[model samples]
Target chain A: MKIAIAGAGAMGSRLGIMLHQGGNDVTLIDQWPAHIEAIRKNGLIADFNGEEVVANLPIFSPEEIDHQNEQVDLIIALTKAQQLDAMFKAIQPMITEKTYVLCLLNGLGHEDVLEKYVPKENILVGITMWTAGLEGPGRVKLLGDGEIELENIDPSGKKFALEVVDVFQKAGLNPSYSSNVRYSIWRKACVNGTLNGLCTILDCNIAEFGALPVSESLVKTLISEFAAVAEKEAIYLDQAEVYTHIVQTYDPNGIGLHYPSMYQDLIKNHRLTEIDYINGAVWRKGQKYNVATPFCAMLTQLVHGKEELLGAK
Target chain B: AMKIAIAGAGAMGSRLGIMLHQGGNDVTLIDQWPAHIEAIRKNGLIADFNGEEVVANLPIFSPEEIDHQNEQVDLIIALTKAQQLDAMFKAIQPMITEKTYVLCLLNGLGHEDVLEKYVPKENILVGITMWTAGLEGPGRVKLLGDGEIELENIDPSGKKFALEVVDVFQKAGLNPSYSSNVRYSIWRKACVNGTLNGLCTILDCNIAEFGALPVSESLVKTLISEFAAVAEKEAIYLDQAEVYTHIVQTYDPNGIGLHYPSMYQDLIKNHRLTEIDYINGAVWRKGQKYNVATPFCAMLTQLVHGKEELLGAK
Candidate 1:
């Protein structure tokens, strides 16, 4: 099977290399000039659990794709939440009626963009617990094990979704088919919404943030907002269960020391963040549903203010 | 003429002390920084008033040294950082007398409660000021533009002394006004500090830089609403829209917008403890007391404390 991973940053590169190693034809599609050049020169290097592993994969910039004259059977959308729409437009030429577009990005409201670019029957929505990091241009850090939960956007896409699951399983992605991926997506969003922007603003790891005296109140207030907005969409979230799942990440023995992706992007790398898609998404939806989401509104504004203050691109 | 002792003589105290001394009052500056007190005692209080430099040779003392001078203070202006207010009062307890009026112009809320502990309620005068001053270093201050004071006595019986303070301040060109309901104006001023100081320190920007963000107005609106809600519980009904407009004007680069709030100076630049516990933290506490959900104030209070811990500030 021919596959292309769009937005070939840290997570995308990690997934693409594994799929390539699983004997599928995988290509990397990205826009970072220096990153593309580094990958093209030395291949994609992964510091897998402290050991260096390199994969020689075909990488292309969006502009360079037209000259390749090749189309793939599947395209994995892994761009930043704000860049998802642009990534779909850039990869439009490669997407065919039979092609399945799988979304594995963080945050909420991704399907709104995915539905606009492809048919509902060709869209696959998924959330992964896998963690990866970009050390520099071409180098990535792959840590401990994780799993993926995926579902087709429509019943008609189930066969293709199953086949994609088989491919992901062969690549050691630990895939499972989720019957209620929407609930799973909101659950994941609650985690990101609490940890990502807060850690980035506070400049702390997940454990450090959780250790704050007011951490419980902060997390409860934020999750309550997310639960309210989710309910407005007819998706009922187990607020208490979601709160426990988030608090468990604060264990120092778990992912406590981990700095979230938003922190890595905005604070570490001085890049813009995906706050608008996470907390900002809730704020917008809350406004539409007439639900009060003051925390979401404040956080979204603060992250954006921080981004501008940092002169992020 | 009034004999006044300016407690916690930092930038704002020094500015007021210099002006009052020049107004023919016997003014003594009491401070914690030894070097600053020594600088003022030796060379006078140097001020750059809109690029025109003037020096006022005023007597200065530390809280410990003030006892040796054996002087009677007619008034005490509590101008210390919110966290240091109690310490300032304790250090200068020997100088405060029954006749001495304690005029507090400190930023943020809950200061009247702190003052009430040190002095009788009948002698406490609480006020808010628009005056802006900067500390260049020890014994040096920068005064730009102009400001006015709105003061009210904690007890109605103290109104006569409060008006006398207004007169003394007016004689010194401090632009004083007697406010019937100073708590309302204090909360209004808090809306400014609560929004600008905490936000700027967290964002690592000046007022104008924060104002430059596209979401600045909305953030200000949301935060002010939190403060307003808590104020309403205290029967201080704030005009939310009016306060929002008042805060938005501070974002102008030509005016207060170019300034870094005192919290930013203390926490970010000076590596000192901030008055967060008195500002946003105070609102969060009161919100809980009133059962109002002040999430913005609550989060900002936590975030500032997080930064303080990150900097290892005292």
Candidate 2:
């Protein structure tokens, strides 16, 4: 299978390398000049579970998409939520009616954008437990093991979706075909919407945020807002169950110590965040649905205000 | 013309003190900052009113000195910082009499409760001000634009004196209106501070910069909703939309938009403890009591405290 990992930053680089190692042809597509140049010069470096390994593969900038000859079998989008639309538009030449696009990006509302570029049957939406980090340009630290849950946008596309899963399984990517992927997506979004923006704005990791006395109330209110907005889409969310899942993530021994991706992007890297797709998205939908989502509204504003204050692009 | 003592004569107090003094009142500036007190005593209160410097020779004293003095003020304007209110009241306890009206125009809520601890409720006059001033250094301050004061006696017994104080204030060009319900006015003003002060301090932006954001309107609306909800429990039915309009107007760059709220000045720039507990924190507490879910207020209170801790503010 030919795979093109779009937005080849941290997680994308790891997936591209693993797929390449699994005997599949993988290409890296990204906009960062330094990262692309570093990979092209020294191959992609990985500290794979404490062992340093390098893989030389085809990497191209989005502008170079028109210059490419071969159409990829699959284009896995892992772009930042704010950049997803532009990234999909840039890689248009590489996508065909036959080309399946799997969106494993964080936050909500990717399928809304994906439908514009490809047929619904060719769109695969998923949530990944897998984690990866960019040490620098071409270098990534890949540790631990995680699984991916995905499904076809159209039920009729399950046959091709299964084939994509097989490719991922063969690459040891731990893929599972889910019948109700939207539920899983909303479930994942609950965690991101609450923890990502809150932790980022509060300047704490998952556990530190949880340790605060007001953490439970904050999480409950945020989850309620998310659940309310999710219901407007005909997706019913169990508020208590989702609240438990979010609170459990605050365990210091587990993922609680980890800074969310938004924190990493906005706080650590001094870049803009995907807050618009998370809390901001909910706020917008709530307005359309006539649902009151004050918590979501305020969080979105605060995150954007923080971004502006930091002079983030 | 009356004997007036301005407590916590930092910026607003000094400005009001100078105005009342020039209005022919015997005004005394009472403060604790030794350097500020010493500077005022030596050279009078210096003010830069929109680039024009004016010096007013007003009697200034420390709380201790005022406590020892034989003279008692007829009116005490309580303009101290929120946290310093109780202490300022206690320090000036020796001068407060049953006849002395203590007009609290301090920012935030719950100053009347503190005043009640030191002064009789009959003599307590609660108010809110649109007046703005800044402390440049010891003995020096800056005054810009103009603002009015809305006041009402906390108890009806103070009404006569409150009206007298209002007349005196108006004589000094301090636009004073006796509000029928001053608690409503205080909560309305708290809505303004609760929305801008904490948000601006946390985001590190001025009023115009924060208000310029597309989300500012919704943010202000939602936060004001929390305040309104809490205010309703006290039977103070807030005109939520009206309060929202009033707050949004402050975001105009031509207005108070470029100014940082007092909380931002205290916690962010000055590294001093903020009045968060009295503003959003107060709303959060009352929300709990009234069983109103003030999530925005709760989060903002915690975030402001976190910022105070992060800044190592005193």
Candidate 3:
């Protein structure tokens, strides 16, 4: 299968390495000249368990990739939300009849967006539990653990599920597939809706938040409110199960000292956060259910204001 | 009936001292705020409120010009800022003839204990005023609205002093009501003051403008609730809706307008030690009391203190 990955940052590069090893034709498309040039010259770097290798993968900037006019079977779109629409527009001309487009972004409601430009038969709605780090330009590191959950956000996981599995299996990136992707997305969201948002606003790490009784209780209260809203939408979530997932994610030694991405983003004055995606999503959903979410609404507004203050649009 | 020397002839002191003068007592108006003191010294202490302008020809002074035996006034009302409460207390201590009951018309909670070092606990009357006054000029005040105060005679003497005060205040039209549970009132105002003051400083806004922001509504409500919890430890209950009403009324033209809270006033004037110590500090203490962590208040205290240290963070 001839596969293309858009905006080959760390995760894209990681997937590029996997598919390259799985005996498939893989092409990495990125915008940065240095990364694209370095990969074309010296090969992409991948590391695992104190072992590292230069994986020989064909890399291209969009100009080079589009000029070739090659028919691509699958394209995994891995880019930040701000870059998503532009990247989609850039890669539009290269999409062929059999091209399967997959996305693994953190937020929900991106598929309807993806369908805006791509043909419905060619787009695959998916999610990844995968996490990666960019060691440097043209170099990336994997934490050696990620789970994947994908199903068509619509009716059945038809040709899209088969295409998703075919792509992942070839890349040697196998994660348990679930029939109910909505439940999976929501369950992940329920935990993040509180944990990430709370930690970021309070300027604490996950475990530090768990240590304070009020902080811990506030997170739970927020999540329970979110759960109520979701269930009202008939998106039944086992609150206990999700709560355990959230708690265990911060279990004493787990990610305790590590700042959540949102906090780091704010500290570096990057973007405020994607709370408009996570906590904000729950907050919006809660409104749909007519649940009075004053606290969450307050938190959302404060973070949004702070974010705007810090030069984030 | 205690003879009172009203030190600090700003609005409250001048107004109170003049009423005591009118009540047929030896009254002395002493203050250092210049215009108000100058007005009283030059033209007598004048009060214009309630469609009436009345002048009380009371004895006035600068500390350098005070006569301890002018009329042997027994008590002193230290209506100065909390910092000056001590110095003014010292300047007038020679007038205390053991019958002196120093009722403080200060803005915070700890002034009573601070005063005990200068006067007897049997003589302390620490008050928190809902009263807002602006000294338009020295000895001249535009008493904007009628606001009551909660006063506690911490060392009630023979129960006579307390009734004497409550009655005397009623007589003077000062309307100083007595409170067995003034701590809650103190906390309530402390909470509101800290919220309004800190927010105004943060946004560089006046009370009316600050009240207009949705953020202000939420933050002020949170600060009040946090303080309510803190006061609850002391059996003081504060209703949030009451604060909502109080704040709304306080911003009304009939209430007060285009005015920053006293804390904001201190910041603009570059004066040190805002009641942030009392208002913001109360939340800090309460956060410790209930082990209910207050991120907002802690951060607020830190930021205001930072401005104090910055002095000029342009």
True contacts recovered per prediction: 0.69, 0.40, 0.02
Question: lDDT for model 2, on a 0 to 1 scale?
Answer: 0.84
Off by over 4 Å in 1: A1-80, A87-102, A117-123, A127-149, A152-176, A233-258, B1-107, B110-178, B232-242, B289-291
Question: Against the true structure, candidate 1 has what lDDT?
Answer: 0.86
Better candidate number, 2 or 3, judged by lDDT: 2
* Top TM-score model: 1
Q: What residue runs in model 3 are displaced by over 4 Å at the alpha carbon?
A: A20-25, A42-58, A63-68, A71-73, A96-99, A119-147, A180-184, A203-217, A228-234, A244-259, A268-271, A283-294, A308-313, B1-314
Better of 2 and 3 by TM-score: 2
Provide the overall lDDT of each model, using Cα atoms, as 2-decimal numbers: 0.86, 0.84, 0.69
Model 3: per-residue Cα lDDT at residue A283:
67
lDDT (Cα) of model 3:
0.69
Tell me the fnat of candidate 3.
0.02
> In model 3 chain B, where is the ten-residue run with the lowest total lDDT?
B305-314
Question: In terms of TM-score, how similar is model 1 to the real structure?
Answer: 0.61
| Recovered share of real interface contacts in candidate 2 | 0.40
Question: Could you give candidate 3's per-residue lDDT for residues B1-314 as a string of tens digits?
Answer: 55777877777676677667776667777776666666666888777765578778777777666555656666777778876777777776667666777777776755665677768778877676676666666667666677776777766472467667778777766777878777566766776686778767744567776666556666777777777766666566788798777877777655675787877778756655566766776577656857875656665665466545444422
Candidate 2, DockQ score (0 to 1): 0.27
List each candidate's DockQ score.
Answer: 0.43, 0.27, 0.05
